[PDB]
Write a protein that binds this DNA or RNA. Structure first.
Length: 49
DNA sequence: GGATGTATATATCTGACACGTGCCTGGAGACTAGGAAGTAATCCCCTTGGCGGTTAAAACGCGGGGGACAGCGCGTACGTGCGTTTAAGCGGTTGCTAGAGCTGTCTACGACCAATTGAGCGGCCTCGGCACCGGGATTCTCCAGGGCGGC
């Protein structure tokens, strides 16, 4: 998911723009991948339950 | 008829009991201070019974070969016994010194107490270094015009 679907230009190494619109995830992968998801300029957060 | 085996009595040896004495250490009596028991408050860790999700460890099965074990041979090294040597064990000399025990004197060193202050613990601000964002320089892919060929 990370290197085939996050970025429009995943093979670059400078500023990588985002490709997806909405990312659905769970709490376990918020805790597991906070380093790879906290460094994203999110426009909206919706926390269910 | 003579000497031998055995029983009872008497003197001597030896461990144990009680008497005597010192002395010094434990006990009795009194006083005091502080160690610890008890109390209240605050805050953080542990308990018991659950749920959810990841995932790597645990469990199970199976094939195969490496290793444990048994047996056998062999040769060597240790046990065994005897004769010989030697040194341990005991008793002994002869002086001097080390050390335990006791008594005595004294002095420097450590306990103790009051005042002081400066080194240890916590937080706060700043720097060294790492990292995020904006701007300039360099290289790669591409769309269109000019020229040539065919019916």
């Amino acid at each position: 998911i990370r290197e085939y679907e996050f970025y429009t230009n995943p093979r670059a190494k400078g500023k990588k723009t985002m490709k997806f619109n909405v990312l659905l995830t769970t709490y376990e992968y918020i805790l597991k991948d906070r380093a790879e998801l906290g460094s994203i300029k999110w426009q909206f957060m919706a926390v269910d339950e």
